[PDB]
Amino acid sequence: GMRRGLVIVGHGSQLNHYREVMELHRKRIEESGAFDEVKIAFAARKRRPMPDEAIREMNCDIIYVVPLFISYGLHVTEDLPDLLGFPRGRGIKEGEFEGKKVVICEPIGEDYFVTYAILNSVFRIG
Amino acid sequence: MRRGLVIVGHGSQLNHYREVMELHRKRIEESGAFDEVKIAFAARKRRPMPDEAIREMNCDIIYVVPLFISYGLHVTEDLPDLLGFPRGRGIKEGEFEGKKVVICEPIGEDYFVTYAILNSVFRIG
């Protein structure tokens, strides 16, 4: 099979906790072993690592870029594809960056799991 | 007891953001998990603010859920301000204008969020 990477793209600026949350999700997934490697990066602002950096340091065949976002706001339809020279707009976008294959996935917002995250904030199972 | 739920977000003048908030209300409304489901907004002045949403609900208890990834000011500051609730991290329950309210934690740390990420790749269903 092919070498599979994953980059979690966020943005919440200079907040201790926001990074800590992004980390928590990278840790959890890294420990799950669902992917050969897991990295975090950041869109819109300039803060580090930008996504071009995170991709560069990964030695995977295919890399899935996941926007940790609720909506298709500019961050997701504009900035992020700009920072990789990917087409702007809504939807899955797959192409190539510096001779690696990249897939920009949809933001998490609309996922049933998000619906359940809400419910579980009340129910608090586990 | 009569159980309400308020989904608090904020992503400003965006068609889609509201639409996503709506989707979740719609889904939960249709699930019948709650007696009533409303959306509202924190930090900015946009409508309905959460004091409004609560006021129109005739429930015994009301769960306020911040559709947020992090404990940013919106959640630790603005929202509990907008109902006269203590500032900071963590679940907060008290009363607003003689109804019991519970401010829940933001969704961000939830395992379901982790899985929302994975499912962005795997795309099951």
Which whole-number Å values give the CA distances from A15 to A115, A126, B6, in the listed order?
Answer: 25, 26, 25
A5, amino acid identity: G
Residues A121, A113: contact at Cβ < 8 Å? no
Q: How far apart are CA A65 and CA A97, in angstroms?
A: 12
Active site residue A11: yes
Sheet with A100-104, side-by-side order of all strands: A37-42, A4-10, A62-67, A100-104, A93-97
Residues A25, A32: contact at Cβ < 8 Å? no
Q: How far apart are CA A16 and CA A121, in angstroms?
A: 22
Would you call B107 and A117 a contact, using CB atoms and an 8 Å cutoff?
yes
- Interfacial residues of B (vs A; Cβ cutoff 8 Å): 5, 7, 9, 11, 14, 16-17, 20, 23-24, 27-28, 33, 63, 65, 67, 69-72, 104-121, 125
Method underlying the structure:
X-ray
**What is the set of domains in chain B, with CATH numbers?**
1-125 (3.40.50.1400)
DSSP secondary structure string, B36-88? Answer: EEEEEE-SS--SS-HHHHHHT---SEEEEEE--SS--HIIIIIHHHTTT---S
A97, amino acid identity: F
In sequence order, what are the beta bridge partners of B5? B37, B63
B31 Cβ contact list (under 8 Å, min separation 6): none
**Facing B14 at nearest CB: one of A71, A119, A126:** A71
B1 Cβ contact list (under 8 Å, min separation 6): B59, B60, B61
- Interfacial residues of A (vs B; Cβ cutoff 8 Å): 6, 8, 10, 12, 15, 17-18, 21, 24-25, 28-29, 34, 64, 66-68, 70-73, 105-122, 126
Cis omega before residue A49 (within 30°)?
A: yes
